[PDB]
Amino acid sequence: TAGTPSGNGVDYQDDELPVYQGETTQSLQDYLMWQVELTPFTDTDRAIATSIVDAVDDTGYLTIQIEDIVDSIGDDEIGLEEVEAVLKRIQRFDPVGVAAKDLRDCLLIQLSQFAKETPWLEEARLIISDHLDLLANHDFRTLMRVTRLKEEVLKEAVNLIQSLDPRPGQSIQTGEPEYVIPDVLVRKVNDRWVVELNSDSLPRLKINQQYAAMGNSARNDADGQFIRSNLQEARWLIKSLESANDTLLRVSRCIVEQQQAFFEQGEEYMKPMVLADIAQAVEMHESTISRVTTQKYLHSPRGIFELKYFFSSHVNTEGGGEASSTAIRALVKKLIAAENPAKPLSDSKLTSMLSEQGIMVARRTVAKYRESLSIPPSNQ
């Protein structure tokens, strides 16, 4: 290693019998319930506040309906008239705009708490937020005529709109778990692309299991011999770990030899690898190989980190033989990305171009591929 990162901060409970214990953390709802406790509320008001705080998502939005909140209470004199009042009180909390019904509600609540002398407060308070929101989503060229205002003033009214916070309530959120990957199966580039299995720790577990179980057995302080108590348990542990490691290594080897085309040259050279294809390769059932490849990750210099991605069973009735949709999806992404400023990319036109390239795909099949991670560039 040319350079090594510094060790990440870790801790463990010392001078405490239940080792490592734990640590409490603050969340969005925990921080909202803290504010509920410190504001003057009645018993029923506190109950409603807890009910609507429980329904706040991580983004801080209100996933459940107000009418559903009223239904949940199931109490007389708890109609939506007072549920709305408690809801507004909660919305005016430290993450301003939290617990909002929708995007319009966030912006309307956020704009309420301002100097009231903002240069374009009233220009964007309701005219842009509470009305013609879809126009602001679009270019809003006609919005200038709709609001009877010049484009110049709107050019900064939308600037203020963007200055307003998009999704309030995810700022207080911490985010300590980075969900990093150890990449149990590193693979490298050689004259034939060899692959290896790291983090096995089987010899490490073997040595520790020896020094503990076989160590106690070999220690002649105890009468007799502990040849069956733990000596024939460490062997089972080692055998289980080695069997799992061998199965994983063999399956990953089959995947690599089949998908070497992906790693070589361009990435989008995936074969539609079905579970049976590797099942016959290892002479083993597909279900056992499948369970194995569910969350195992490989480290690639350029390739994606995920065994399941290679399966792509997408014969797609391609012209010569078969193909894979994931490669077809990458092709569609690249084609749509590199187009004219108009960028038609019509699902009929895109399908015709793909068929000319040799991929006989239906017109609607390309549309589902595009809608998976993109939007039509004014193709309508």
Binding site: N8, Y12, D15, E16, L17, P18, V19, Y20, G22, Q35, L38, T39, R92, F93, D94, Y179, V180, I181, P182, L205, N208, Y211, A212, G215, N216, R219, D221, A222, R228, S229
Partner: protein, 245 residues
């Protein structure tokens, strides 16, 4: 008995869970083998091993050697959790870490009265944060608790004025780490000072067995009408002048 998390998404089982897993595995294997009409020797071996696993779970290190984990130290059993200095009785209960607590080095204050002590103003505004929030919201400076929290975070001058009133008549307790006697902790009226060290009256140093060559004390706040009165009536320095020995 939660397992410990690891880098990425991996989880490591604590020593309490290892004993439970061993017991469950042995019990399941014995139960399955008992239905197969296995020879009595194997059944006896399995029964003895299950008995040993249960004994290790209840009190590891008894009747034989002690089961150890990945490293060569015994696994903590159920009995290793309720006994000893690190046990709940001596650690969690009979002694506890507490909120509203501080600590720093002590210096001498010769200008101090006997009932007074010098408190760093940076320790206060943290030891007395809820009181400051209450006074801020009571005087109309802050309407919501969020506003008061933001105002305290910025430490404006009016916050310092409010803090002084909070410290106007609220006794505080100072304690030195080896408390051989009750004179180990004494009550004082805090005096706000600019600095980072607690100023201690020279006449209580002998009772504290304290000197100004690196000693530190802890600070505790009695946030109760009863606790404040007890500090003023029982634990103040001007109260305990004669040694109760």
């Amino acid at each position: 008995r939660p397992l410990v998390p690891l880098d990425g998404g991996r989880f490591a089982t604590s020593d309490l869970n290892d004993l439970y897993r061993r017991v469950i595995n042995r019990n399941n294997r014995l139960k399955r083998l008992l239905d197969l009409a296995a020879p009595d020797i194997i059944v006896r071996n399995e029964k003895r091993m299950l008995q040993e696993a249960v004994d290790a779970l209840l009190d590891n290190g008894r009747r034989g050697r002690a089961i150890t984990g990945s490293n060569k130290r015994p696994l903590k059993s159920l009995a290793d959790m309720i006994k000893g200095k690190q046990g709940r009785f001596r650690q969690n209960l009979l002694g506890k870490r507490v909120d509203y607590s501080g600590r720093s080095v002590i210096t001498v204050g010769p200008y101090l009265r006997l009932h007074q002590c010098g408190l760093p103003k940076k320790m206060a505004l943290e030891l007395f944060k809820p009181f400051i929030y209450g006074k801020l919201e009571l005087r109309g400076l802050a309407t919501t608790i969020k506003a008061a929290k933001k105002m305290v975070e910025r430490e404006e001058a009016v916050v310092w004025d409010i803090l002084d009133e909070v410290i106007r008549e609220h006794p505080v307790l100072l304690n030195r780490a080896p408390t051989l006697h009750r004179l180990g902790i004494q009550a004082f009226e805090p005096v706000l000072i600019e600095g980072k060290a607690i100023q201690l009256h020279p006449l209580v140093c002998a009772a504290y067995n304290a000197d100004f060559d690196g000693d530190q004390m802890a600070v505790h706040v009695p946030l109760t009408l009863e606790a404040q009165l007890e500090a003023r009536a029982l634990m103040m320095s001007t109260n305990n002048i004669l040694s109760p020995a």
